[PDB]
């Protein structure tokens, strides 16, 4: 009944801004939501946003007639290099619907069947790497998952080989992208971004943007000198509405977007999935049993991957507890009241805190912190807008099918070929680069000695 909104602790003139002066801002906002509940106001000089954590309010926020996708401050900083690519465009910019129409067919069932062989090429490189480890050598999990996911989007999307399994260090692309993301996350807490103490930060940022754009003009130059892949559709496809193709500036932004959006979160998903599987041995056993039963050939087929149902549920349960793109932003299209209590003005910003949404006890029950893939047996038994790891509506993840096909294929092959040991009894440490990923997660993989 027009309730007053809670607000976390303030720092005078800086309002709530210093609460983001941490290497783990999403984990900080989750603790605030635990303390303040389903909604709280966050204020900095010149800006306000309302953090939502309950399925009760988020099911309203997901009404596309009332709320559209907002560029959060984080996405405004990413737009410095991702421009009006699909992830960092407003819905009302011409290039959003145009690129959407042109690129959606690059995620058709026909398209996924076409990507499968190249996903297998990279997955086989991962399995061969682990088969070739010596006694008592370990696996650096997020490092190897990032090698796989970057190489997969490079090859499937652009017929480009990053060759990440030939490198003991990350590809220059990854090093520059991680630093750009870390700069973008860093600028969020930065009062007085014009301070000369940040002139080197700016210089380094521009440098990192130059590294990713050099690789893009090279992917483009490569293709020019001679495929039916994502890059084919970017260069040739026409929007059925206008009959127009994408312009060169936009195409560059889409390549940068798909290299970032198309691997970082999938590497996080695979890393968290393997973390929960080694921490939950009964779940690991059930998934390994399915992989053994289904993947009866040396090379997995598209159809077999579609039959790894329990592996698919493991991936959804990992996205429930640690959604690797952990927030999305909305703005009110008009004046509206939220849950009958919180009046909003046109333009008012909302932040969906996805990990908190996924811990709503009124949806999942009291065992909400438990890793239980069986929660996903029946999508009709899950309330509306309870599970939002790929965002909402027409602005939902275009790459969800690609990511889940790749992750199901790879996790299936991992569970078929190896037994895993949590040999250090790893303590979860979640590194934030806007996206979430376990840091320092290592395992030992004992070969089942099954040939490829
Ligand atoms: C690539 C995808 C997965 C991402 C989604 C994100 C959504 C919200 C972000 C993000 C998690 C990074 C950390 C801050 C946070 C939680 C945020 O709300 N920030 C708000 C509010 C804010 C924080 N600091 C600010 C400084 C100035 C202005 C606004 C802000 C914002 O960025 O808009 C960020 C990471 C990148």
Please give the DSSP secondary-structure letter assigned to residue 89. Answer: S
Q: How far is CA 375 from CA 177, 316, 366, 371, 391, in A?
A: 35, 9, 13, 9, 20
**Nearest-5° angle of CA 257, CA 259, CA 262?**
90
Residue 274 makes CB contacts below 8 A (sequence gap 6+) with 141, 145, 411, 414, 420, 441, 443
Positive or negative CA dihedral for 107, 108, 114, 120? Answer: positive
CA distance 188 to 48: 13
Please give the DSSP secondary-structure letter assigned to residue 247. Answer: P
Active site includes 390? yes
Rg from Cα positions in the chain:
22
- CATH number for the domain spanning 314: value is 1.10.630.10
**Nearest-5° angle of CA 255, CA 388, CA 360?**
150
In 3D, which of 45, 126, 398, 82 has the Cα closest to residue 259? Answer: 82
**What count of Cα atoms within 13 Å lies in the side-chain half-sphere of residue 221?**
6
CA distance 102 to 245: 8
Contact 353, 29 (CB under 8 A): yes
Q: Does the CB atom of residue 62 touch ligand 1 within 6 A?
A: no
Decide: helix, strand or coil at residue 226: coil
Tell which one of 49, 188, 325 to mutate to probe ligand 1, the residue whose CB is within 8 A of the most ligand atoms.
188
Domain, as residue range, for 149: 1-452
Active site includes 62? no
Torsion, Cα of 231, 406, 409, 170 (10° steps): 100
Q: Does the CB atom of residue 49 touch ligand 1 within 6 A?
A: yes
> How was this one solved?
X-ray
CB atoms within 10 A of CB 395: 20
Q: How far is CA 70 from CA 84, 85, 91, 183, 348, in A?
A: 13, 14, 9, 21, 10
Catalogue the E-assigned strands of 216-341: 327-332, 336-338
Contact 185, 432 (CB under 8 A): yes
Contact 96, 71 (CB under 8 A): no
Q: What is the resolution of this structure in A?
A: 1.5
**What count of Cα atoms within 13 Å lies in the side-chain half-sphere of residue 174?**
23
In 3D, which of 274, 318, 292 has the Cα closest to residue 144? Answer: 274
Decide: helix, strand or coil at residue 328: strand
Q: How many domains, in total, are found in the chain?
A: 1
41, β-bridge pairs: 50
């Amino acid at each position: 009944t027009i309730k007053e909104m809670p607000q976390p602790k303030t720092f005078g003139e800086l309002k709530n801004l210093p609460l983001l002066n941490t290497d783990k801002p999403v984990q900080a906002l989750m603790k605030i939501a635990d303390e303040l509940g389903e909604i709280f106001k966050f204020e900095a000089p010149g800006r306000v946003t309302r953090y939502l954590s309950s399925q009760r309010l988020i099911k309203e926020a997901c009404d596309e007639s009332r709320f559209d996708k907002n560029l959060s401050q984080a996405l405004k900083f990413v737009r410095d290099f991702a421009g009006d690519g699909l992830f960092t465009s407003w819905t009302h910019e011409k290039n959003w619907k145009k690129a959407h129409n042109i690129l959606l067919p690059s995620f058709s069932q026909q398209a996924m069947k076409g990507y499968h062989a190249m996903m297998v090429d990279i997955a086989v490189q991962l399995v061969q790497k682990w088969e070739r480890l010596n006694a008592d050598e370990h696996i650096e999990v997020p490092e190897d998952m990032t090698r796989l996911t970057l190489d997969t989007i490079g090859l499937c999307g652009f017929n480009y080989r990053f060759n990440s399994f030939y490198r003991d260090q990350p590809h220059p692309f990854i090093t520059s992208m991680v630093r750009a993301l870390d700069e973008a996350m860093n600028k969020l807490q930065r009062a007085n971004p014009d301070d000369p103490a940040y002139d080197e930060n700016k210089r380094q940022f521009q440098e990192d943007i130059k590294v990713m754009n050099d690789l893009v003009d090279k992917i483009i130059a490569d293709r020019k000198a001679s495929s039916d892949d994502l890059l084919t559709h970017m260069l040739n496809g026409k929007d059925p509405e206008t009959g127009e193709p994408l312009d060169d500036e936009n195409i560059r932004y889409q390549i940068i977007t798909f290299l970032i959006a198309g691997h970082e979160t999938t590497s996080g998903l695979l890393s968290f999935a393997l973390y929960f599987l080694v921490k939950n041995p009964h779940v690991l056993q059930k998934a390994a049993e399915e992989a053994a039963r289904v993947l009866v050939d040396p090379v997995p087929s598209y159809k077999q991957v579609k039959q790894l149902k329990y592996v698919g549920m493991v991936l959804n349960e990992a996205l429930r507890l640690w959604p690797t793109a952990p927030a999305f932003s909305l703005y009110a299209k008009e004046d509206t009241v939220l849950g009958g209590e919180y009046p909003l003005e046109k333009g008012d910003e909302l932040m969906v805190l996805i990990p908190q949404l996924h811990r709503d006890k009124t949806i999942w029950g009291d065992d909400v912190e438990e890793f239980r893939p069986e929660r996903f047996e029946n999508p009709s038994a899950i309330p509306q807008h309870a599970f939002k790891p790929f965002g909402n509506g027409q602005r939902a993840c275009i790459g969800q099918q690609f990511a889940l096909h790749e992750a199901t294929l790879v996790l299936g092959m991992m569970l078929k070929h190896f037994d895993f040991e949590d040999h250090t009894n790893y303590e979860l440490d979640i590194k934030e680069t806007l996206t979430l990923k376990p840091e320092g997660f290592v395992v030992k993989a004992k070969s089942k000695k099954i040939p490829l």
